[PDB]
Every structure is written in C-alpha cells, then in structure tokens.
Write a protein that binds this ligand. Sequence first.
Ligand SMILES: [K+]
Ligand SMILES: [K+]
Ligand SMILES: [K+]
Ligand SMILES: [K+]
Ligand SMILES: [K+]
Ligand SMILES: [K+]
Ligand SMILES: [K+]
Ligand SMILES: [K+]
Ligand SMILES: [K+]
Ligand SMILES: [K+]
Ligand SMILES: [K+]
Ligand SMILES: [K+]
Ligand SMILES: [K+]
Ligand SMILES: [K+]
Ligand SMILES: [Mg+2]
Ligand SMILES: [Mg+2]
Ligand SMILES: [Mg+2]
Ligand SMILES: [Mg+2]
Ligand SMILES: [Mg+2]
Ligand SMILES: [Mg+2]
Ligand SMILES: [Mg+2]
Ligand SMILES: [Mg+2]
Ligand SMILES: [Mg+2]
Ligand SMILES: [Mg+2]
Ligand SMILES: [Mg+2]
Ligand SMILES: [Mg+2]
Ligand SMILES: [Mg+2]
Ligand SMILES: [Mg+2]
Ligand SMILES: [Mg+2]
Ligand SMILES: [Mg+2]
Ligand SMILES: [Mg+2]
Ligand SMILES: [Mg+2]
Ligand SMILES: [Mg+2]
Ligand SMILES: [Mg+2]
Ligand SMILES: [Mg+2]
Ligand SMILES: [Mg+2]
Ligand SMILES: [Mg+2]
Ligand SMILES: [Mg+2]
Ligand SMILES: [Mg+2]
Ligand SMILES: [Mg+2]
Ligand code: NA
Ligand code: NA
Ligand code: NA
Ligand code: NA
Ligand code: NA
Ligand code: NA
Ligand code: NA
Ligand code: NA
Ligand code: NA
Ligand code: NA
Lengths: 80, 105
Amino acid sequence: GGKGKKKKKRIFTKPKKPTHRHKLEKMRALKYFKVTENDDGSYKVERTRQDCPHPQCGAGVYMAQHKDRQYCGKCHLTYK
Amino acid sequence: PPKAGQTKKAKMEAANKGAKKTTKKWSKGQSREALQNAVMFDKETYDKLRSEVPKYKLITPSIISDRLKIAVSIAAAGLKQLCREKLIRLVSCSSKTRVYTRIVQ
RNA sequence: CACCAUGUUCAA
RNA sequence: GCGGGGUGGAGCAGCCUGGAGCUCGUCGGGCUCAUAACCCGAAGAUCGUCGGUUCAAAUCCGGCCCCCGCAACCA
RNA sequence: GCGCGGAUAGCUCAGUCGGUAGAGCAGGGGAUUGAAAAUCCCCGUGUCCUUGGUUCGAUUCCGAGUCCGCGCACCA
RNA sequence: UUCGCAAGAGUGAAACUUAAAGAAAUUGACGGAAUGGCACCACAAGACGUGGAGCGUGCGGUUUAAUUUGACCAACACGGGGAACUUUACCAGAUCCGGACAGGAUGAGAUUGACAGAUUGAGUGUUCUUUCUCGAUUCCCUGAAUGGUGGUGCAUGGCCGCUUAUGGUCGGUGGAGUGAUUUGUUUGGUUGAUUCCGUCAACGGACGAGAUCCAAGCUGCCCAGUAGAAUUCAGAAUUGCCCAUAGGAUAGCGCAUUCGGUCGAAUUCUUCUCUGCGGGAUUCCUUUGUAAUUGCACAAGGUGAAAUUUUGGGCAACAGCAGGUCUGUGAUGCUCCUCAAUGUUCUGGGCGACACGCGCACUACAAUGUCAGUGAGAACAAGAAAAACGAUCGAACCUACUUGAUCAAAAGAGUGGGGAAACCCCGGAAUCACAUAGACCCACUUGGGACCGAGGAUUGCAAUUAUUGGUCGCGCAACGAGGAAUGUCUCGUAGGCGCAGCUCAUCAAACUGUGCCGAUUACGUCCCU
RNA sequence: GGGCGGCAUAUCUGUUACACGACAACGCAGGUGUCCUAAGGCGAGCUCAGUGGGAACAGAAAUCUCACGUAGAACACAAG
RNA sequence: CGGGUAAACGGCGGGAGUAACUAUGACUCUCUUAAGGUAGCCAAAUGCCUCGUCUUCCAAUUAGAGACGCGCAUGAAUGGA
Ligand SMILES: [K+]
Ligand SMILES: [K+]
Ligand SMILES: [K+]
Ligand SMILES: [K+]
Ligand SMILES: [K+]
Ligand SMILES: [K+]
Ligand SMILES: [K+]
Ligand SMILES: [K+]
Ligand SMILES: [K+]
Ligand SMILES: [K+]
Ligand SMILES: [K+]
Ligand SMILES: [K+]
Ligand SMILES: [K+]
Ligand SMILES: [K+]
Ligand SMILES: [Mg+2]
Ligand SMILES: [Mg+2]
Ligand SMILES: [Mg+2]
Ligand SMILES: [Mg+2]
Ligand SMILES: [Mg+2]
Ligand SMILES: [Mg+2]
Ligand SMILES: [Mg+2]
Ligand SMILES: [Mg+2]
Ligand SMILES: [Mg+2]
Ligand SMILES: [Mg+2]
Ligand SMILES: [Mg+2]
Ligand SMILES: [Mg+2]
Ligand SMILES: [Mg+2]
Ligand SMILES: [Mg+2]
Ligand SMILES: [Mg+2]
Ligand SMILES: [Mg+2]
Ligand SMILES: [Mg+2]
Ligand SMILES: [Mg+2]
Ligand SMILES: [Mg+2]
Ligand SMILES: [Mg+2]
Ligand SMILES: [Mg+2]
Ligand SMILES: [Mg+2]
Ligand SMILES: [Mg+2]
Ligand SMILES: [Mg+2]
Ligand SMILES: [Mg+2]
Ligand SMILES: [Mg+2]
Ligand code: NA
Ligand code: NA
Ligand code: NA
Ligand code: NA
Ligand code: NA
Ligand code: NA
Ligand code: NA
Ligand code: NA
Ligand code: NA
Ligand code: NA
C-alpha cells in the first residue's frame, strides 16, 4: 500500500490543544492565614482553610474551598 | 511474483467473471440401472425360498437376493430360518458373512 | 537419425 | 437496367424452413527457468435492418442501407 | 462549375439520427528494478461547421457555409 | 579504361566510419560429440496419492481507511507466522518524553499531580473554569542527544539455505613451459568414496571421504523400599450330573484352577525392567564361483542378535551466490523521522475483508463399509511462581477418586496425590478383533458432513466478524474414484492408525517426535531429469 | 426509333371506367400453367377470431371453466 | 475410360490484422485456383478516372522528355525487354 514510514501530512480539523501551564498564585500562605490582634499587643493567627482529616493525608496540610465543594490536593477527598 | 505482461484490471475482472462453472466433469461416470429389491417377503417369493433355495450347492445372502429380487437383509433372515429347521447347513460363519449349503439326501 | 525456435539496456 | 453478397473478434460454409458450422483469434489450466510451439478444457452468434408468410425463418416472400460485378450501342 | 461524404480531448478514432460522450496513443504521479526498457495502477481533457425548428434541448434535425475528400459537366 | 557474345575478368580509389579487428596457446563453462560410472529430490517394476468435490491454511489478485510486510528446484501449514486486546510492524484518533547533557531567560515559588462541571470514545486534570497539593526533581529556547518491527541484505557482521550428497580441494621442493598454466591429482581393475592395488617426474604433506559422536537391536559387571518375579503360610471364590433359541472348528488326559482390595504375612531371587563403563562384526569362515595371472576385491552360502558405511542420524573440505535475514538481539555503517513524532502508550478497527487463479493439507465418495455393543491391548513425553502476596510453608501446574445423581451432555464442586521410574499408571490409544447367530442392503442411501437455526456451559479485562466444547434440528452442498499433468518412496519401509510435546488464558486440518497394524514391486538401467 | 430491359404475346381479381353493358396506354396494385382420394359427395353435431373473471407446477403466452362475442375467423393458392 | 501435349487455342485471385512518433507493411490469419503474372516494361500506338503526381523544357505547356506505378484492361515466339 503506502510507502514505508512516509510522512503523512494530515490536515487537522480540531484546534490544537495547548499545554497546561501551572497558574501561579502570588503569596499563597498570606491567604491561608488571617492575623488577629490581642489587647496585650501579641498577634494570634488562625488558618481560614480547612485541614484534610485523614492523618495519612498531610497532617498539618490545608484543604481547598470552592463555591460548590471543598477538596484537598493530597487526599483528593471532596465535601459538598 | 509472476506478474503477467500486458494483463489489465479489465482483463483481470473479465477473467474471474467468466471463470464460474463451465469446466468440469473429467470422468465418464457410466451410470447404472437401479436395483428394485423387495424389503419384505411375498407369498410366491417366500414359497420359492422354502423350496427352490435348498438343493443349491452354494447358498449366500447375496446370491439369494440376486435370485428372488429381494433385499439382502431379509435374504439373510430367511437363510437363518432355514438353518433353524435344518433344511440348509451352515459351512462358514462370522459376524459379517455366512455361507450355507444344501444337506445331503 | 520424427519435431526441439527464442531470451530488452548498463553493471556486479 | 440486369445479376450476386452481408453469418461469434477475422476470413469463410450452411443458405435445399425446425440450426448456425470450419480454421484462426480470446479465456482457464498444463509443459518450460520463461515466451512461442505442443497438450487438456471453456466461452463467445439481432445470421445487415424493417415488415409479411408459415405451427415454426440464416434458410421463404417484399422494402430499405451498404458492398461487388455486367451493360451504357448507331448516329 | 456542379453533386455527394467528412470537420468530437494535445493527435487518431467510436457515439441509440431524438439524454453521449466509448476509447488508444501523447503527458503528470506510484507499483517493479541495483538502476533502466517494457508492463501494471491512479489523474487533465472534448461539439465539429452556423442559423433555425428548438422533441423538454440537438455532433446527432434543417440553412449557410467553409475546409478537406469523391464523382461528373458541347457537338460533330 | 582494356578485354569478353554475355556472364564477367584485369586495373582500382575517395568521402565517411571505427578502438580495436585479428593470431596461437591456457583454465573454466557449454554441446541435439565420444567414454566410464552414479542418484527412486531420476527413470524402470510398482505402491499410495496430488490434479476433479467440500473444507482448513499459505500465496497472488480484487476490495479496502487499513486489508503491515519478507520470500516468487533453493517463495506459497515458510518467516517457528495457529494475529480477539497485547504481540503489530497497517488504518482513524487521543496521551507521555523515555529530548540525557551543555549554554541562556524565569525561579523558592521552577514545577508535578489533581476532586467537581464540560471537552472527549473515555467518573481520560488531555485541556479548560476553580483552587488545593507537590516541591529545585522540572519546566521555556539554542545546539545536541536518544529511540524506532524506518529505508538500504546491492554498505556489512553472525547465522542459515543453496551450488553439492556427490567425492572433491590445496601447498612445499623437484620436473615441463617465455608465459598464463601443468605434473603431482594420470591411465587399468576396484570401491558409495581422489576407497584401495598397481604404474609413474614426481617425492613428501594437509583438508574432505573414512575414522570420531548420538540413538537402535544381542550380551557382561552393577542395581533397586522410585523395577519386578517365584515359592510357603494363612483368608475368600469355582467345583462336575448338566450339551445354547441352529451351536461347528480350535491345546491339555505326587498335587484341579483362580483371588494387583484378601490393599494379609514370611522368605528367596534377578527370568522381565532401570544403566555408567565394557564385549560383540571383520569380508571372519567355505566355494574346484567371478577375478587373480601379484594384488585390491566381488558374488552366493555359513556362523550369528546383527553379513556388509550393521541400521538411522549428527558433523562435514575448498571455492563461491550481490541467495535469505538491517521484522531475533543492547549485531551494526550511512541515511530518514524526532514533542499534533516514523519514538512510546491508550481506545477502536485491520491483519481473517471475496466474481477468481495457484501451492500444501484435512474429509470423502462407501459393504475389504456405516452404525450400536463387547474384548484384548503401546511408546515418546509434559506437569505448580518472584527481593511479589498472605501465615521456612501455601496458591497457581497436571491429575486420580467421589459427588453432581431422587435422572442428558458439557459442566460445576470436594478430597487426596505428584517437583515426576514415586501421583496420573497395572499409562484400558486408534487401526484391530468378535460364532455380536445385532441393524442397514447398492441408494447420493443409516455413505458424506459442508452450510445454516435455536438453547446452554466454559476461557478471557473484552467472544459481535459464530474463541472453544456439548444438545437437538438442516443435510434435497458438492462428491459415485477424478482430463492434460504431477509428488514421495526399497522393509518394520510405503500406506494406514492414533498419542505426546510445541505454539497455548482459550483454540491443530501445522510441525517435531512416538509407538501400533503392516504390504506390492525392483535387487536394475542410463531411455527421461 | 431500333437495340438492351420488360412483356402489356394465352389468361384471373380490384381500380382506372365516368351508378346498364362496353372502354386505351411499356396505366396502378397483385395473380395463372399448380394443389387435393380428401382439400370431392352427403348426413349429423358444433361455432369461429378475439376479449374478461377464475383454476398447482404455469409466467404475455401450455390445459380446464364460465360469460360476452354479426364474423372482426375459416373456406389450398391473387383478389373480389 | 486411361496417358502425353501450350514456340496447340489459350489462361495466369480475394478479404483482414500487424514494427517503440506517425505513414507504410518485411510478418501473420483466412477463403480459394488448372495455375493465381515470373523476368521485364509502363498514364507506352495499351490508363477509364485523367489535362494522374513530381522534375525538366516556356513569360505562360490538355503538348514533349525523364521518373513513379493501386497497371479500367502491361507482360514473355498470342513473343517480353
Ligand atoms: K524474436
Ligand atoms: K586458437
Ligand atoms: K534438495
Ligand atoms: K492474501
Ligand atoms: K512493540
Ligand atoms: K550475509
Ligand atoms: K563434491
Ligand atoms: K622454468
Ligand atoms: K562401483
Ligand atoms: K549441512
Ligand atoms: K563458505
Ligand atoms: K370440407
Ligand atoms: K481470345
Ligand atoms: K511555349
Ligand atoms: Mg520429480
Ligand atoms: Mg482439491
Ligand atoms: Mg481447483
Ligand atoms: Mg538441488
Ligand atoms: Mg515451506
Ligand atoms: Mg486464533
Ligand atoms: Mg513502532
Ligand atoms: Mg532495533
Ligand atoms: Mg546477500
Ligand atoms: Mg592439477
Ligand atoms: Mg568445487
Ligand atoms: Mg493498538
Ligand atoms: Mg496472514
Ligand atoms: Mg453454539
Ligand atoms: Mg505454523
Ligand atoms: Mg427505345
Ligand atoms: Mg356510364
Ligand atoms: Mg359499367
Ligand atoms: Mg509485375
Ligand atoms: Mg501504365
Ligand atoms: Mg498516349
Ligand atoms: Mg509547342
Ligand atoms: Mg506529357
Ligand atoms: Mg513518359
Ligand atoms: Mg491481360
Ligand atoms: Mg498481349
Ligand atoms: Na549505462
Ligand atoms: Na571496371
Ligand atoms: Na578452451
Ligand atoms: Na512408475
Ligand atoms: Na485426486
Ligand atoms: Na614449481
Ligand atoms: Na609444484
Ligand atoms: Na541499519
Ligand atoms: Na542418463
Ligand atoms: Na362434412
């Protein structure tokens, strides 16, 4: 039939898929914490993000927040 | 490969379309007449077996079928009966073949 | 002592 | 004006109602290293075309279209 | 001078007189080759000659033709 | 131009064209030239087929998105090539980088990975929206590099096939030629044999042949609790008068036979079996044979298990082929693609697609048979798993027994055994046999199963393009012995008949072996090749 | 004109032919020299060519059946 | 009936395909005779078409000559050249 390993040069109908680039969020840890002020002058900080409950999934690691769900990067568990 | 010279696709196609049937029958054959052999005994045929079949020097199911125009299956059945009544005697016997002959005197 | 014609071009 | 002929792809019988034959060609398989020759098989017909007769038309009777002959003299 | 027959792809030649464009060769690209010839496969073709009646429409039916073939044109 | 009746004879150029044309010898190759031998990949005498039918399979064509491709005696059940996915090299699409390293631009936010919705063939983070996780491993671009069943076997290595199954091949020194070259290596007889004897401008050697090696047959030592046998005690069975529904032929004329579950003991032994070294066979023996006029040998018979390479294989020189393989390899030079790749994965399809032609098989066309019973009976062989997973064994692998079964097959289960002379296994193979008093009775028929329908089970992640069994239907599909042609074969052979291994999760019409039943013909020839 | 051709030289039907009979041409369209022992003679039964509905193989067309059917068939050969 | 005899009278074919540009047809097929026209010669005092086609001769050539040959219908003592 066709020539052995000859370049095809086939037309493309679908648009080319771009490579996925990691979208960088500046100063991420500033967003995971809200700084409070106490009357003695000392500052107390508590995280505004949930922690993934499973000990295997990142003891001391955070958990995301979307309008419809709440999931984590490691444990991959989602709450709706 | 022996690619034929000047052979077309139209030449190819016309070759296979005309290659169906036609050439056959390399043997003469020489057909035969059917054998009309009765599968059951008639009155006159059964009378012949009880009288004419004895005093035959050589008796065989295929021979009796050739005389009385009957099947060998019932020709052998009658011969086994004639032995039960000692009218004929059995000289050679096996599962597939039986040979009988007439009794002396 | 029947009949027995032929083999594209260069180069291994 | 007179006489003859169109039949498988080629050439030609049959043209003596009821049918298409011969040689070559084509196709398939053999032989051969291969082709030809040779061997074993096969297929292929509006019998020019339009009508008529006949139970039935290559085949008989008319028209047409071509092809080939013979005549076209005395002024 | 007259009558008849041809002008279809790049060339040649088919085409139910009214729906047909069949091809071969010449080309471009592949198969085969150690490279070629040759062979095979796939692709580009076209009314002729000019007016009419246009069958619903014309190489195909008529008129003109060109442009080429083929015949034939006192009398004594 | 001269001569001739003519035919011609004498004399006799040029233009142009061309790198050789010729001569004699040498070595090959060839001959429808001669001589002597040999081979059933040759014939003769034959056997059994193939060519005709159906079907399996390979090859070509046709078709196709693709139907991947090599090969055309020495291609065509060949590439161990029996492809559902993989393999797989082809087609339609989607991922990954498995672009190391070096130099630059970013950078402790370089990057990696992702649930939900939709993009999609994909509850495929491929991409996108939205964020979390990761962490200096990576991304961006320039060179480079790697990988490829990409090309080229006409660039090669290695291996294989073939020339080429026959008896062939090559130095040294000496002789002969100016030389290629020749002699040795030659003729005569013999032999499968350049095998020997003899002769000799050759003498000494080397390789191939032979020898060696592996299996068969006969046999020695050894040997058994992974092979067996014979006795003796016990325990059980038959036990004599018996004449078949017609019942022939075929051994028996101190103690009658059986009983691998009677899972009984004791004793003895190596007749069968296992096998590492041996023995044995070589023209050994004899012809008032052939030949001998020395010899080398040969033919019949003998001895013998075996009587002429004992039989069957393995190995096999030197010269080659543009033979096959770059689709075996981390064998490889050059060249091609290289981030929407000719790399690599994943999904699906294809390799199977059918007016046809060909090679090789399978099954047949029936009575020297088909069915349904019953009997006796081989050999070679294969059998399970890790640095994984469970608690050093235990599960994969093969089986036997039981059950399913208070009712089809194929199944499905449980138990036990086997690492394989230990279990399978006393290996109940099929040809075969049966005086089976069985059915069929010459017909496309109870021959022949192609083709097709419905149920069910099993293998697998997946069965549609039936994977494979089993059940009932179809059988009105050809086929009644095959034209011209053509293959293989000399004795445990052909032909027939099964069995195992191999491919293998499932699947032999294949191959590689194995045993079983077992002939006809020839003991030649150079007519064909 | 004659020759070549044909035959209009013996003869039949239709038309020319002019509604009695008769009527020419090398006028038109065709025939004749044969054929039949039944294709002659007679008597009796029947109805034809075609259509339509229906009936296995069977279809446009094979044979059976029922209707309609003034001749649209046949009467050896041309025609009336 | 059977032989001989043509320097006796005389006679001496047709169709189709085919060469790597295209013509053409050495070649082949087929039907056929008693034999299928040979050597020669030719639009010849013999060629219809025809005033054939080319060359030459002229300012101009139905004429002349030389060529060609599918030759209505040339041709060998019906003697050919
Ligand atoms: K030739
Ligand atoms: K010479
Ligand atoms: K061979
Ligand atoms: K194929
Ligand atoms: K692969
Ligand atoms: K090689
Ligand atoms: K040799
Ligand atoms: K010398
Ligand atoms: K010998
Ligand atoms: K070898
Ligand atoms: K070699
Ligand atoms: K009558
Ligand atoms: K005359
Ligand atoms: K003049
Ligand atoms: Mg042979
Ligand atoms: Mg066959
Ligand atoms: Mg065949
Ligand atoms: Mg050979
Ligand atoms: Mg093979
Ligand atoms: Mg398979
Ligand atoms: Mg690949
Ligand atoms: Mg590789
Ligand atoms: Mg090679
Ligand atoms: Mg020598
Ligand atoms: Mg050699
Ligand atoms: Mg795939
Ligand atoms: Mg295949
Ligand atoms: Mg089934
Ligand atoms: Mg195989
Ligand atoms: Mg006149
Ligand atoms: Mg009147
Ligand atoms: Mg009147
Ligand atoms: Mg002549
Ligand atoms: Mg002339
Ligand atoms: Mg003249
Ligand atoms: Mg003048
Ligand atoms: Mg003149
Ligand atoms: Mg002249
Ligand atoms: Mg003449
Ligand atoms: Mg004359
Ligand atoms: Na060259
Ligand atoms: Na001279
Ligand atoms: Na020589
Ligand atoms: Na033979
Ligand atoms: Na056969
Ligand atoms: Na020397
Ligand atoms: Na020497
Ligand atoms: Na390579
Ligand atoms: Na020979
Ligand atoms: Na009457």
